[PDB]
Design a protein around this ligand. Structure first.
Ligand SMILES: CCN(CC)C(=O)Oc1ccc(C[C@@H]2CN(Cc3cncn3C)c3ccc(C#N)cc3CN2S(=O)(=O)c2ccc(OC)cc2)cc1
Ligand SMILES: [Ca+2]
Ligand SMILES: [Zn+2]
Lengths: 307, 324
């Protein structure tokens, strides 16, 4: 029955596909093709040529139909697309067809599209197709960076699965401060926010990755507030190290903080932390040896700068 | 923390004879008839894995060459199958196959070049076809196709570089388009692109290399981005990218080797995305190609840029310098 029905499916798809192609060669760009492809694209959204067929039909019908009839066809297409996305939200072809459709509409409802994105991101906060679509919509509707920044903040605090949200923040922050390194007041606020994130959940790598970026966004240029904030982070990571002695992210971040503070003064401690970290994260031992070699060479150059 | 656990009786030896029988018999059927939209690429995956295993002769060269010729459209682009529409993905696949077979002049090369050239946009990006989807995957398809044909000079290379670099992220990786999140697949495409165009000095190799080696999970398998399950395919994309930037040693090679071997189906042959799953040709190529990069003696050396046997690329003198 189950294996038998997947022969019944095969033949209907086969016959439907046959029919679409015959009609296409015959120049029959009509609503029967929309009917035939809807029966195939729901189960087989990566069949790119059938999406091409729908666009050719919609383009042709736009020429020989009334504005009111074209408007009805568009609304039907939006609903078909939404139904397809519910079944497979990870198909390149479905998301592209929606972008194609919205880009040519006279009066696109962009607020409705942003709400659709919010909905899909509630279901999968890591869906990159949907994040990409949201950026497309944001550009088209001239949604300002500060608005999108507000969206990321609510997503980051309400639950985990934050890599996609933090990534979006890294792209939006530089737009609020467009320089032909973030400004220090902005950086300090970001350090506070991310520090909350990884002390709340020390296992979520997204916060640690974002933090490393902020540590690179001068040492002998350290203000007293930044110097004091970094020293505080250092002690706070050492506290976490006690609570979670197998947490490799906190150990690496301790090394990076000492580098950001004073490479030569913290040489001894830095080398000690490399030994512990390699024991905790052995698969990365070769990376960690190369990082340490890089740091030892940097230290040699700093020692040679001595007057 | 998301990972697989490899059971103690998972395959732990390379079943080369079985994989060759699996591919040689493939498409002799539900999934076959349903995947006709990717047939040209399916053919590429099959032929490349056979050639890496020394078994290319068991496939049907003459049948495949006629099929390729019948898939080139009047615009110069190549479709996945007869009557389907042309796309950069299947144009690359076709040119890769013809290179494997030293039969590039079976198609109209001038028209291929014209097709590729036509798909570049003002910002240097490439659309996949006339319908305008922009993806760095297609920048790679464009330059890899042209490199294999000796015609990289046909596109606007500095603009193409500017677009790809505009897709570099806070973590050193690359996504589909500007502002897109880093993903192993797109990192492979962008690092391969920069290798072909001689721009690897613009990658932050230590930073990107760190992001890539953190893809390795305790099972030994690699995921395609943070907090996802491991997969044989992402694993190849990560390994090839690491090799291009001279940092293949940053992952645990023995642990990954064991993960890849565990994905084999010992009854049917083939590799699946993860142990216990159903195999397919796509994951079969990437399993074999990954093992080659890790130095498996029974498999031919594979190019991390083109995912073809190095000996084929040597023959046509297309071997981009890496950061080792
Ligand atoms: C990065 C290399 N490039 C650019 C040169 C590239 O185009 O590679 C691709 C990357 C992704 C794709 C989309 C899918 C990938 N998948 C699905 C998959 C892979 N790993 C986990 N999954 C869920 C597959 C899977 C199997 C096969 C086979 N045989 C082929 C693909 C290729 N495509 S797909 O849209 O055509 C596809 C095929 C089958 C499928 O169901 C099994 C789902 C999607 C296609 C090509
Ligand atoms: Ca033969
Ligand atoms: Zn896969």
């Amino acid at each position: 029955a189950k294996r038998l029905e997947r022969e019944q499916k095969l033949k209907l798809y086969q016959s439907a596909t046959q029919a679409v192609f015959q009609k296409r060669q015959a120049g029959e760009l009509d609503e029967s093709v929309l009917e035939l492809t809807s029966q195939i694209l729901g189960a087989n959204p990566d069949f790119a040529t059938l999406w091409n067929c729908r666009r050719e039909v919609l383009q042709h019908l736009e020429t020989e139909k009334s504005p009111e009839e074209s408007a009805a066809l568009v609304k039907a297409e939006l609903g078909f697309l939404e139904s397809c996305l519910r079944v497979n939200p990870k198909s390149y072809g479905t998301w592209h067809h929606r972008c194609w459709l919205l880009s040519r509409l006279p009066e696109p409802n962009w607020a409705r599209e942003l709400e659709l994105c919010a909905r899909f991101l509630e279901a999968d906060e890591r869906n990159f197709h949907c994040w990409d679509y949201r950026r497309f919509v944001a550009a088209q509707a001239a949604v300002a960076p500060a608005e999108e920044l507000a969206f990321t903040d609510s997503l980051i605090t309400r639950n985990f699965s934050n890599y996609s949200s933090w990534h979006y923040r890294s792209c939006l922050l530089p737009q609020l401060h467009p320089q032909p390194r973030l400004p220090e007041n902005v950086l300090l606020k970001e350090l506070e926010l991310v520090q909350n994130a990884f002390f709340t959940d020390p296992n979520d790598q997204s916060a640690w990755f974002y933090h490393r970026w902020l540590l690179g966004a001068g040492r002998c240029e350290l203000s007293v507030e930044k110097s004091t904030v970094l020293q505080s982070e250092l002690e706070s990571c050492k506290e976490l190290q006690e609570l979670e002695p197998e947490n490799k992210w906190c150990l690496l971040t301790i090394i990076l903080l000492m580098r950001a503070l004073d490479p030569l003064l913290y040489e001894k401690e830095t080398l000690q932390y490399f030994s512990t970290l390699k024991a905790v994260d052995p698969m990365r031992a070769a990376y960690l040896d190369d990082l340490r070699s890089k740091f030892l060479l940097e230290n040699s150059v700093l020692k040679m700068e001595y007057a | 923390q998301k990972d697989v656990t490899i059971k103690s009786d998972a395959p732990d030896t390379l079943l080369l004879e079985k994989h060759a029988d699996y591919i040689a018999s493939y498409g002799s059927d539900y999934e076959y008839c349903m995947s006709e939209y990717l047939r040209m690429s399916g053919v590429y995956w099959g032929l490349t894995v056979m050639d890496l295993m020394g078994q290319l002769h068991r496939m049907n060269k003459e049948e495949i060459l006629v099929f390729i010729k019948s898939c080139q459209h009047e615009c110069g682009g190549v479709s996945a199958s007869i009557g389907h529409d042309p796309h950069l993905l299947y144009t690359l696949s076709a040119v890769q196959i013809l290179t494997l077979y030293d039969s590039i002049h079976v198609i109209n090369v001038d028209k291929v070049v014209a097709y590729v050239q036509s798909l570049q946009k003002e910002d240097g990006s490439f659309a996949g076809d006339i319908w305008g989807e922009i993806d760095t995957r297609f920048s790679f398809c464009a330059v890899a196709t042209l490199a294999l044909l000796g015609k990289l000079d046909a596109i606007n290379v500095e603009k193409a570089i500017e677009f790809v670099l505009s897709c570099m992220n806070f973590d050193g990786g690359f996504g589909c388009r500007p502002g897109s999140e880093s993903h192993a697949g797109q990192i492979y495409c962008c690092t391969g692109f920069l290798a072909i165009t001689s721009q690897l000095h613009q990658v932050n190799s230590d930073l990107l290399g760190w992001w890539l080696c953190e893809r390795q999970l305790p099972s030994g398998g690699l995921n395609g981005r943070p907090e996802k399950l491991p997969d044989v395919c992402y694993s190849w994309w990560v390994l090839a990218s690491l090799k291009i930037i001279g940092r293949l040693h940053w992952i645990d090679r023995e642990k990954l080797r064991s993960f890849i071997l565990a994905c084999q189906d010992e009854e049917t042959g083939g590799f699946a995305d993860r142990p216990g799953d159903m195999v397919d040709p796509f994951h079969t190529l990437f399993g074999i190609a990954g093992l080659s990069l890790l130095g498996e003696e029974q498999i031919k050396p594979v190019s991390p840029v083109f995912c073809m046997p190095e000996e084929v690329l040597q023959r046509v003198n297309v071997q981009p310098e890496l950061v080792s």
